[PDB]
Design an enzyme around this catalytic site. Sequence first.
Site, PDB file in Angstrom:
ATOM      1  N   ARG A  37       0.807   8.158   5.830  1.00  0.00           N
ATOM      2  CA  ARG A  37      -0.050   7.400   6.745  1.00  0.00           C
ATOM      3  C   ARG A  37      -1.508   7.872   6.675  1.00  0.00           C
ATOM      4  O   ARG A  37      -2.438   7.080   6.853  1.00  0.00           O
ATOM      5  CB  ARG A  37       0.459   7.554   8.183  1.00  0.00           C
ATOM      6  CG  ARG A  37       0.224   6.357   9.091  1.00  0.00           C
ATOM      7  CD  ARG A  37       1.337   5.326   8.929  1.00  0.00           C
ATOM      8  NE  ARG A  37       1.306   4.300   9.970  1.00  0.00           N
ATOM      9  CZ  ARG A  37       0.392   3.336  10.054  1.00  0.00           C
ATOM     10  NH1 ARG A  37      -0.576   3.257   9.151  1.00  0.00           N
ATOM     11  NH2 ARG A  37       0.437   2.454  11.048  1.00  0.00           N
ATOM     12  N   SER A  77       0.828  -1.205   0.000  1.00  0.00           N
ATOM     13  CA  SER A  77       0.000   0.000   0.000  1.00  0.00           C
ATOM     14  C   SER A  77       0.862   1.254   0.000  1.00  0.00           C
ATOM     15  O   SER A  77       0.659   2.153  -0.814  1.00  0.00           O
ATOM     16  CB  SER A  77      -0.923   0.030   1.227  1.00  0.00           C
ATOM     17  OG  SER A  77      -2.069  -0.779   1.037  1.00  0.00           O
ATOM     18  N   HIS A  99      -2.999   6.850   3.396  1.00  0.00           N
ATOM     19  CA  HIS A  99      -3.233   5.426   3.564  1.00  0.00           C
ATOM     20  C   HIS A  99      -4.587   5.179   4.239  1.00  0.00           C
ATOM     21  O   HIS A  99      -5.453   4.511   3.689  1.00  0.00           O
ATOM     22  CB  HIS A  99      -2.122   4.821   4.418  1.00  0.00           C
ATOM     23  CG  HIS A  99      -2.369   3.400   4.818  1.00  0.00           C
ATOM     24  ND1 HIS A  99      -2.540   2.385   3.900  1.00  0.00           N
ATOM     25  CD2 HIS A  99      -2.431   2.816   6.037  1.00  0.00           C
ATOM     26  CE1 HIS A  99      -2.694   1.238   4.535  1.00  0.00           C
ATOM     27  NE2 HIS A  99      -2.630   1.470   5.833  1.00  0.00           N
TER      28      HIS A  99
HETATM   29 CL   LIG Z   1      -6.197  -3.569   0.716  1.00  0.00          CL
END
Ligand SMILES: [Cl-]
Lengths: 217, 217
Positions: free
Chosen positions: B38, B15, B41
């Site tokens: 972050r 990711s 994310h």
């Molecule tokens: Cl995912």
Amino acid sequence: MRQITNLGRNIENKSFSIIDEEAGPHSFAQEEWEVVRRIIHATADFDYKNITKIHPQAIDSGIQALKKGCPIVCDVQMILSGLNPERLKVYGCKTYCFISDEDVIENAKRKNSTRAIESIQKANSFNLLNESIIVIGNAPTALLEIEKLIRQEGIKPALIVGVPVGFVSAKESKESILKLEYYNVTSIPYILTMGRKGGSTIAVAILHALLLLSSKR
Amino acid sequence: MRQITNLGRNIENKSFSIIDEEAGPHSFAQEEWEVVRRIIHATADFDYKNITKIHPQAIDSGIQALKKGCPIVCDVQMILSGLNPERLKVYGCKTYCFISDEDVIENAKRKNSTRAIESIQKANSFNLLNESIIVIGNAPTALLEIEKLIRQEGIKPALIVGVPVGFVSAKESKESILKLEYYNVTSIPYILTMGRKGGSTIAVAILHALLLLSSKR
Ligand SMILES: [Cl-]
Ligand SMILES: [Cl-]
Ligand SMILES: [Cl-]
Ligand SMILES: [Cl-]
Ligand SMILES: [Cl-]
Ligand SMILES: [Cl-]
Ligand SMILES: [Cl-]
Ligand SMILES: [Cl-]
């Protein structure tokens, strides 16, 4: 019911009004729009006006199970930590989240899977995915396990709130629920946010909107 | 520490790399970028790449606070119920959140304010706002009262994580912090998400990122 100053209530109604005005014309029903707008409100992100998809039976099926005091299974704890227990007692709904349970974490490391997948399986072993509301707001692997259990076994939850956020399987995890809808005549009702966007807050937003909708007889 | 299957980790690293490749060139420092990343994310929203503002001392100041087991006041429960207690115990940080309290809820109804403002005030009446890390993630009015206390009184938090999402005062609450930074030679370090976007999810993301940084030194 809900603890919020009359001021906060004014700030909120002031926000929904702005949100309505801004968004513009949309394609949802009154009852549905309330859920969509509630997500926009929780994120100040207007993309949920497009990425949000509400199965035609989602609202009824969900509000109905809620009144029956059905269980509510979440993948991450935060989602639980965002519901007014007082509002839930009225119906008598029990809540769950085995993501941090001792055994779940033991099986996950052993099976080389994820905690979310293993907690979905645990809820399944207790028949908790039956006629309940499953809220997946963080783990796509969780929503995929549901996808699987639906085809494999017959698990028939009352409503699936699949709004996990992710960069690897998030997108797919939600698309697959739509594939089940295509092939089955009577599919499991859902509310999901297509793409990578989602999160605990989005889920909580939805639950609150659904509850408030139920509240309004 | 962090209970997360070996699998879940590879999913996160995949990711993060996706986030990096996609984001493109940015104006953040290595350590700072982490925090920003972050957030993107936790939300799958790249706007935080532009709306996120980090004070020069926000990272050094905030980490230093954590190391010294500094208090951590939050505006909403959602945030506490999202931080691994195991990690905070290491430094021995105490977590606070009076938004649910009885007197707090009371004083609010009488003062015609919001539970948020009154909880920031109670936190004030305990010396919990000095050298502490103030994490506001939903109530702009909380951040506004904090601003007011930086002016009226001299409260000196160690780090203000001001990421309240809102439609009525969100934008302004965060801006008022930038004002203090302007008029003061030495202001209170912050990490805020400009505009009206935000949320407890973002808060937690920032905290975790901070804690992680702290764990690499
Ligand atoms: Cl995912
Ligand atoms: Cl639409
Ligand atoms: Cl996952
Ligand atoms: Cl999340
Ligand atoms: Cl940049
Ligand atoms: Cl507020
Ligand atoms: Cl606001
Ligand atoms: Cl929030």
